[PDB]
Amino acid sequence: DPGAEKVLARINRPSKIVSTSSCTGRITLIEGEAHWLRVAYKTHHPISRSEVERVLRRGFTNLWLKVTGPILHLRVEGWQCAKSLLEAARRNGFKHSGVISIAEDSRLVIEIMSSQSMSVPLVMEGARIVGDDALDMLIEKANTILVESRIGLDTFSREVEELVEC
Amino acid sequence: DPGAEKVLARINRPSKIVSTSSCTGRITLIEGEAHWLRVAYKTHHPISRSEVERVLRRGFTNLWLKVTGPILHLRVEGWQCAKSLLEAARRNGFKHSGVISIAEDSRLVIEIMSSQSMSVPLVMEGARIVGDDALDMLIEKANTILVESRIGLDTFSREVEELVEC
């Protein structure tokens, strides 16, 4: 399901739900002391050692290897649908989900965010802090999280189509 | 401000806001492949090398060094106060903030969560993956994040007292 097109179709099926933006999950290499806000490199696919080595060769003073699961933003009509949606999200791995604002047209703006993630410093203060054996395990871990975090998005989309209140 | 007692007093001053639970931010060593849900060790203070070494000696197959900024749960009376509160949270470093549910008494249940964090594997598949120079930098980083993440909570509490709508 490239781009999660099938998942998004299911999520958009309900008349009271409309997705405005989505991210299927990604692996990024972020430069700087803080990774929570830029992006030296990003990919929505499992990352290779070569891709990581290319960024390490760029000589950033501080570099993070970060993987984040899917995150969705929706416009929902009514609290009854939003309620069922948030409960569904939390059951499928999106622990971090809630209403963030209310649009001028009164629709609820909801954010569905995956609980799966990893934010690991690869380089700190100009010093690479991960040896080769470690880097391979971290790369394998980032890829595992990326792939597995999408499963919950799929099951969630399955659940959403069934939400009667929506 | 031990325990953030002053911060909590300010946040609870408004008649339309009541905190039900809070965490001033913490550093934890979590066992297992997933760190997002247990806790091998936790501390709300900067961590020492000795504290970390004690857990490493326990021989966990998988171990994460995790630091999370402050997180608050509040019961808020009305969307006008909740709106001003969420906007205030986001301005002070709590990017992850929203209404998660609505209590039976109709008050809004809000979650304010810090954007600062780090989740780094220390041991994976029985193998310690961080050398000594690296561990010291990671420990220093975890402590920096813990301390700095509390600043936003303080400024936020300052802002909250001023929220007219609350």
Whether A61 has its CB under 8 Å from any CB of chain B: the answer is: no
Residue owning tokens 């939003």: A82
- A42–chain B nearest CA distance, Å: 19
**Contacts for A144 with CB less than 8 Å, ≥ 6 apart:** none
A164 phi-psi bin (left φ>0, alpha ψ -120 to 50, beta other): alpha
**CB distance A98–B99 less than 8 Å?**
yes
Distance from C-alpha of A127 to C-alpha of A63, rounded to nearest angstrom:
10
Whether A98 has its CB under 8 Å from any CB of chain B: the answer is: yes
Residue A94: give its domain's CATH number: 3.30.1960.10
Mutation target vs A (from B100, B102, B136; most A CBs, 10 A cutoff): B100
Whether A101 has its CB under 8 Å from any CB of chain B: the answer is: yes
Whether A138 has its CB under 8 Å from any CB of chain B: the answer is: yes
Q: Quick check: helix, strand or coil at residue A68?
A: strand
Q: CA B32 → CA B20, B46, B61, B120, distances in Å?
A: 29, 23, 7, 12
DSSP symbols for A88-157: HHHHTT--EEEEEEE-TTS-EEEEEE-S-EEEEEEEETTEE---HHHHHHHHHHHHHHHHHHHHHHHHHH
Quick check: A97 and A112 in contact, CB under 8 A?
yes
Mutation target vs A (from B35, B36, B65, B114; most A CBs, 10 A cutoff): B36
The domain tally of chain B equals 1
Nearest CB among B119, B129, B137 relative to A124 is that of B137
Determination technique used: X-ray
3-state helix, strand, coil in chain A (%, to 5): 40, 30, 30
Strands A63-68, A26-31: parallel, antiparallel or unpaired by DSSP? antiparallel
Per CB-CB distance under 8 Å, the chain A contacts of B99 are: 98-100
Whether B89 has its CB under 8 Å from any CB of chain A: the answer is: no
Whether A104 has its CB under 8 Å from any CB of chain B: the answer is: no
Q: Which two tokens stand for residue A72?
A: 């969705």
Among A81, A79, A84, CA closest to A15: A81
**CB distance A119–B118 less than 8 Å?**
yes
Q: Which two tokens stand for residue B134?
A: 């690296």
DSSP summary character for residue A46: P
Tell me the residue range of the domain where B73 lies. 1-166
Distance from C-alpha of A136 to C-alpha of A123, rounded to nearest angstrom:
15
